[PDB]
From a paper:
Among them, [name] protein is an important mediator in several protein complexes to exert its functions in histone modification and chromatin remodeling. The WDR domain typically folded into a donut shape with seven bladed β-propellers. Among them, [name] has been recognized as an important binding partner in several chromatin modulating complexes such as COMPASS (Complex of Proteins Associated with SET1) complex that utilize the SET1/MLL protein to catalyze the di- and tri-methylation of histone H3 lysine 4 (H3K4). There are two protein–protein binding sites on [name]: A shallow cleft on the side surface known as the “[name]-binding motif” (WBM) site, and the other one located at the center of the protein, which referred to as the “[name]-interacting” (WIN) site and usually bound with an arginine residue from its binding partners.
In the present study, we employed the phage display technology to perform the biopanning experiments with a disulfide-based cyclic peptide phage library. Based on the results of sequencing, the frequency of sequence and the similarity with the [name] binding partners, we finally synthesized 5 cyclic peptide sequences: CRTLPFHEC(D206115), CEKMVATHC(D206116), CRTLPWNNC(D206179), CRTLPYGAC(D206180), and CRTLPFGSC(D206181) for further evaluation. To analyze the details of binding interaction, we solved the cocrystal structure of D206115 bound to [name]. However, as showed in Figure 3, the supposed cyclized peptide was adopted a linear conformation, which indicated that the disulfide bond was broken. By scrutinizing all the reagents used in protein buffer and crystallization, we found that high concentration of Tris(2-carboxyethyl) phosphine (TCEP) was used to prevent the aggregation of [name] proteins during the crystallization. Nevertheless, the solved cocrystal structure still provided much information about the binding interactions between D206115 and [name]. From Figure 3, we can realize that the arginine residue stretches into the deep pocket of WIN site, which formed extensive hydrogen bonding interactions with nearby residues and water molecules. Besides, the positive-charge nature of guanidyl group sandwiched between two aromatic residues Phe133 and Phe263, forming the typical cation-Pi interactions. Except the residue arginine in peptide D206115, other residues generally just situated at the top of the WIN binding site, without any visible direct interactions with [name] protein. The essential binding interactions between the important residue arginine and the WIN binding site of [name] were illustrated, further reinforcement of the importance of arginine residue.
Numbering used by the authors:
A (entry chain C), D (entry chain D): 2 to 7
B (entry chain A), C (entry chain B): 31 to 210, 212 to 334
The structure:
């Protein structure tokens, strides 16, 4: 899920 | 010599973060994919919204165009890819097989194959015409952040949070090379237009240009911020020879490919610029940003 | 379905016949050219007069907008084209080289090129940034009535009183096909928004929709009067899919694209309606008429 | 031109 960090 | 990219259009319409923008190979369209489960199509030169494309059940992390500009493929959290007829908006095929969400995708130049990478840690090669999986490559030991076909589709380069980029022979699915000093997570990779080099981003605020033959690092570009997101980078070749990348400080970064100097930063976005793309023939950049911005910006330079 | 275009504004100001009206790609302005040697700018939605643009030494037959709505180009009887900055009204470049009246003009979508057609029987491709003629096509054996780029800029279509319509490869200048000996002069040509069809006017009271790929006539639209003037026609795509044209009986004609039946005739002008244009996002038509009338009318529909 | 017949 590209829009989420780490 | 340095570019002078100025803002031309701001494209609003996505209702969650934007995840990927790509220009069509014929240059006429920009496609955008978003956490809002939607693809939007925009005119590349006037910014004019054209249509929304829908069908995925969860958010979309990537999108890419067939070489004739008639097909799109999307990678989604619903664990599928979908092949879209751009003219009609219809889903032509749903590509099932990944066991976790699909992060990245690309057509090959022939546009009879699709490559995909997933959190399930595998790379898959699909038949465009049938929608069937041809090969599953056990490519990595962590989420695959990017996949890319070289200039003639003979090779695929992949990257992963595991710290590697691997180069695969497309016909056999066998691994040709594994570029390895340290192994910070690799967040993006792609071939240069001539296929000789690969540009790789790691989550230590670093971009690197590798010679694919010798497996040697030729250049490092830094000064941007990249520690959390898989941000797209690009070769800009229509005017000056640049490297272009988004950045977690809400700016678009542009470097001289040769001198590695930051030659322009593009202000405007109000959140992480997760995605950039370079027009195939004009000096135009598209950029896009995460949930507190949700917009796409088209920028134009005289050089 | 039938539309319901109703008159909303009549725009007065040209002191001679008007020759061409065009909406800016951002939907904000309407530009008009005239035999009075002037270009006028009007608000597209309220009709309010904005500015006069002058510099040509003789009448102007055509006008066209760059994709970012910041530039105009005009084709004039003084044998030049001129490129204009719309905000300042200043003449940025004068394009010299045709050996006779310049009749028609258009930017490509990228707006780095201009195509022009002239009574000197040639088509010319010009560089916007420098104003240099890049190529001269010996396109026809009689005055050239229309020139138009397709949606990605790689094709030019031309038409002529010699009876021919030809499609050109932008990059090389080479002729890709002819859609033909007498040939009831071909008075107007343009691509459909999707690039597959070409709409062609012949001076025998006929409009025809051509499949460019197969070279076959798919639709024929009649009812109006067109024996003498090169009348602009359009696709209307914001609401119902129509064909729109002016007419020598002082009416605007609107046909159903698919069934070829007239769905509306617009009444009001008091001379030949030489030019019609369709707003890029709203169901708005601009029409413009010859010496006895000299006005531009705006018409608005709910569909 | 354009605004002249024939």
């Amino acid at each position: 899920c590209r829009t989420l960090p780490f | 010599v340095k570019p002078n990219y100025a803002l031309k259009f701001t494209l609003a319409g996505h209702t969650k973060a934007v995840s990927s923008v790509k220009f069509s190979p014929n240059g006429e369209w920009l496609a955008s994919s978003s956490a809002d489960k939607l693809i939007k199509i925009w005119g590349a030169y006037d910014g004019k919204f054209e249509k929304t494309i829908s069908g995925h059940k969860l958010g979309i992390s990537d999108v890419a165009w067939s070489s004739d500009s008639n097909l799109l493929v999307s990678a989604s959290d619903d664990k599928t890819l979908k092949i879209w007829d751009v003219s009609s908006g219809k889903c032509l095929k749903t590509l099932k097989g990944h066991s976790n969400y699909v992060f990245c995708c690309n057509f090959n130049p022939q546009s009879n194959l699709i490559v995909s990478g997933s959190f399930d840690e595998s790379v898959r090669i699909w038949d465009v015409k049938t929608g069937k999986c041809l090969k599953t490559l056990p490519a990595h030991s962590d989420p695959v952040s990017a996949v890319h076909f070289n200039r003639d589709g003979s090779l695929i380069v992949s990257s992963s949070y595991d710290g590697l980029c691997r180069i695969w022979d497309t016909a056999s699915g066998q691994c040709l090379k594994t570029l390895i000093d340290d192994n910070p997570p690799v967040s993006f990779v792609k071939f240069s237009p001539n296929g000789k080099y690969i540009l790789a981003a790691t989550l230590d605020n670093t971009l690197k240009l590798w010679d694919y033959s010798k497996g040697k690092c030729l250049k490092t570009y830094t000064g941007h911020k990249n520690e959390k997101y898989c941000i797209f980078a690009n070769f800009s070749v229509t005017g000056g020879k640049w490297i272009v990348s988004g950045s977690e400080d809400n700016l678009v970064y542009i470097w001289n490919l040769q001198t590695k100097e930051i030659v322009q930063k593009l202000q405007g976005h109000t959140d992480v610029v997760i995605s950039t793309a370079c027009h195939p023939t004009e000096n135009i950049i598209a950029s896009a940003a995460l949930e507190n911005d949700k917009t796409i910006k088209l920028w134009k330079s005289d050089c």
